[PDB]
Amino acid sequence: SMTVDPIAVCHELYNTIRDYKDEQGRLLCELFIRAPKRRNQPDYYEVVSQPIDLMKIQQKLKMEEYDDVNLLTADFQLLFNNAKSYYKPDSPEYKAACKLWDLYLRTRNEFVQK
């Protein structure tokens, strides 16, 4: 719709990512629940400067911080870009990042289309 309620749309988009299974029945978001701890993953933090995960995004959602769809988009962009920065194209993480990002955008586009 051209006239949307961002708080509502952001809740739906989070739920989309939270609940999605691929055709193999894999709950792809499970790979993104927790980012590696800084003090336990020096290789990851050589290539990732600002970590984020679904725990953080869920907390922000609960705190009502997503009142602009662009803010949620930026957080998922970071979430998936960080994964693609460390993990290589053949990895489950990279593949799931590409798939969930594309799902995010497609779902978003249906909510905010003219």
Residue numbers in the entry: 41 to 154
Authors' text:
The most notable structural difference within the BRD core fold is a hairpin insertion located between helix αZ and the ZA loop that is present in all family VIII members. The proximity to the Kac binding site suggests that this insert may play a role in recruitment of acetylated binding partners. Helix αZ is flanked by a diverse sequence region and a β hairpin insert present in all family VIII BRDs.
